[PDB]
């Protein structure tokens, strides 16, 4: 329904978060299928890192676009 | 698409790997050590099975007792029970079956002869490699025939050659056991940083910045 | 519903398993090292009971002395005190007892034969397995009877088999001790990994955001 | 120029050496253990080929059977297949080629004689060093000729020395096996230390300070 | 062709980061070629630490101008 | 009442355990390594006391030289000085005594026999366990008598038995020293966890909300 | 009385330990690993200097060649250059000298014997522990005199005694190397903790509250 200038910014990263959930779930499943390799452990760290990076980047975006105009509305007078 | 249950699925995945990957290997080494201990009993029984003869190079060697004992050990180790199976690591009660693909994938890393796969009626199981014991038990029959009422008569040189072959077979069994034990560094060493999947809990708990 | 007593619960649980899991392993390793100390002493002594016989391939071996020594070792290890018990890791004075379920679980995880559980009247204790040493004592009787007033006569051909059996038993005991010690790589490491329960205080104390 | 691809190359190169560095050691150990098992089988079969001659120190030696069996072993292990290859870790089907540079850089570390590198039409392969076996099977012909219909007649004075030399050859080959097995402890530990390249992701993910 | 002061500071770091990122791969592939020595592992470790510490220096040298200019804006009245 | 002196006692008790808990460990492992360095010097130096006996099975063994060397080692290591004491880890000059309570506490967790406490007049000190070595030099006497002017006449079977006993003692001392070194994994790890009392100064400074 | 001078002090101090405490350990590890590589090369060269003697249990061993090679190695590491010094981690040009105080104070924890301090006329340097290596060089002539123009003959019992002594010495040196490398747990991690001196630039620079 309604969406401001922050909701769309948040949803901009939502196209990759779902993809990365699917990919990391497959990573866990294929690790369960066979764990006798460090390649999957390395891919696991490569993918969980990208997950944390997406989440932290989205949090930073919403925080900075909060503070971009919190100060402007503070001196809105 | 959830993160609350991803930690639970991580925990259950770690639990399933322990009893499907580590517990299996523990049962393998346990049953194989039991096998080696039984064989050590058999070898210890060998001491009271020799008799000097001719006051020279001849030593009577008991073959009927060795044949019977090794045949009995094979018979008790050719069936399927909790003390004969190494995969799929039977425990508690009953006998569990396994598929062909996983049996092959286990034989590829266990380095065992293919003459070990047998069917427990419904499915398939992996058993201890009995080929060295078989080869030894038909080779000991190659020293002659038990014409005497008690045991074979045989000079020292053939006894030395036979004992050298015997000890070579036993060092092969011992190095097999050494490989299985050294697979600690192949299983626990990588499990120690495979348990680091808990980063999916800790590193996904620093995301509180999403809720400030 | 309280979070101040949860830290006390954590503190008491961490020390409640130190003597339940790692302390038990500590006393098990200590008592097994004592057992191997006794066996190594009795083996080093054994070098001093051999003589040549008829100046030929025959070498005497003392059986009655070895039988007496091994039986005395068993009898001294067959009691129940702080020097011959594995579980529940007695210390100081008296004998602490254990229930059937946890003793059975510890026996199953330690991979020891059934002839290791004794009943100390009230509860149950776990003792060192005497099966290999009893096996060797029974097999050394398979070399005959102490017909001579001092020791038995027996040729080099039989001596090689007897020494092979003795070395097999000794290396079986060595591998048992090695397995027990390598259980530390899989016990102390996960103890240090479980000390990370301190996160329960770390993260919950950083919750001062509840009060700004 | 980005970082997702460098994480991908780390996750790819951590496995590019699994089947190129550690897997090579794996098949080397497997094939050499199979070699030693076959040699032990030949040794065991050799035992029952001895008979006392002139009822004295003379013991017949079966030269022709040993020569035939060792010649057959040389012939069957002189080929290049899955059971007679060391490099480049052939598995599944065919035989994989290799260039001489990596063959030299491998044999330098394996500490092996030069006469082990062959060309399989296109590329280069490494096989088991037959130099000890071939030199001993040549020496066995240098101690007599099969003039008799069945086997040589010869006194034990030189027979005992020949058997001591043959056991010394077995000891040398077994020490080579031990060195190749300890190559794991020089490589498997090295591999589990090298798998700690994962800092390239651990530290490069906690630099999120780029975006808080 | 805009590049403000923050972009100016980042310009002095991007050219340094690119060189480290190009040489860390040349360290990694060499290590994968011949991993039998520890000296090459140490060299790769040093190059990786080089890259990450320079990146962290870039990361911190920008948030330290952020608060300077923010404090200027606070007293900008 | 104040909490600035808590910061100073955090420093002073880390000082009071840096050289009283980890310091005693490093001193014990250092002196024990020096002990085994001297003992291995003796053992390697033992090698040059073998001669063939009558060019046959006999091989002369030196007992008097080993007796004197081992007795000298005991005498030099039975005293109390800088290189013969474990606790209280004396260093620099003089001899530092310790009280009985802490001596027993350290004996229990160092896993040493009760026959190790020596009193240096005032208090108590803990030294290396010399019981295996002294019993070894005692039992080497029971190996025979040095009736000859130089060395004892020693046959191969008894020599092999004595060497087996010697190697058993050697691997026992290996196990002891390995346990002592592995006690780093138990002590240095907890000390590096306990140095995190630095949080008690970091966190008690982030309470500046009292003064904004 | 200033804070910018505090920051300059921190900047110069964090460099006054990076190359004077951690750098010392790094260079010590590097040179000691070079020494160990030389030892491994010597071992590999020696591994092919064996032969049977009298076609029996006697073994040929090359004593003069090992003596010459090891004396050359010792007297080449008995000098002072960039590859034979531990402290003060000489590099670049010339030879860096040192006085008694810090040299003694840090060889105290480097745990080296007294016969390891060398004097370059003006100052003092720390060199590797040649004492076990000189001891092996000395006792390799404890086997007797080189009667043969090429190499010594000795019965196999003495051969395994000597090889066991050599293995004990090399494993003692390996334990020394392991301890010296594990000293990184006390040097590198401790320097990683000590670099937190920058909290003066972190926390004391937050005192801009003095300037609003």
Curated annotation (Swiss-Prot), chains A, E:
Disruption phenotype: The null mutant strain is non-invasive. Induction: Negatively regulated by PhoP-PhoQ. Changing residue 8 to A: Exhibits constitutive secretion of substrates. Retains the ability to display SipD/SctA at the tip of the needle filament. Changing residue 74 to M: Cannot secrete the translocases SipB/SctE and SipC/SctB. Retains the ability to assemble needle complexes, but is not able to invade cultured epithelial cells. It is found in: Secreted; Cell surface. Changing residue 60 to A: Exhibits constitutive secretion of substrates. Retains the ability to display SipD/SctA at the tip of the needle filament. GO terms for cellular component: cell surface; extracellular region; type III protein secretion system complex. Changing residue 55 to A: Exhibits constitutive secretion of substrates. Retains the ability to display SipD/SctA at the tip of the needle filament. Binding of bile salts, including deoxycholate, to the PrgI:SipD interface may inhibit the T3SS function. Changing residue 77 to K: Exhibits constitutive secretion of substrates. Can invade cultured epithelial cells. Changing residue 76 to A: Abrogates host cell invasion and effector secretion. One of its GO terms (molecular function) is identical protein binding. Changing residue 7 to A: Exhibits constitutive secretion of substrates. Retains the ability to display SipD/SctA at the tip of the needle filament. Component of the type III secretion system (T3SS), also called injectisome, which is used to inject bacterial effector proteins into eukaryotic host cells. PrgI/SctF1 forms the external needle filament that protrudes from the bacterial surface. Is probably involved in the transduction of an activating signal, thought to be mediated by the distal tip of the needle filament, to the secretion machine. Required for invasion of epithelial cells. Required for the secretion of the effector protein SptP. During infection, can induce innate immune responses. The needle proteins interact with host TLR2 or TLR4, and induce signaling by NF-kappa-B and/or AP-1. This activation is MyD88 dependent and results in increased expression of cytokines, including TNF-alpha, IL-6 and IL-8. The core secretion machinery of the T3SS is composed of approximately 20 different proteins, including cytoplasmic components, a base, an export apparatus and a needle. This subunit polymerizes and forms the helical needle filament. Interacts with the needle tip protein SipD/SctA. Interacts with the needle adapter protein PrgJ/SctI, the secretin InvG/SctC and the minor export apparatus protein SpaP/SctR. In vitro, the needle protomer refolds spontaneously to extend the needle from the distal end. This is SPI-1 type 3 secretion system needle filament protein. It comes from Salmonella typhimurium (strain LT2 / SGSC1412 / ATCC 700720). The gene is sctF1.
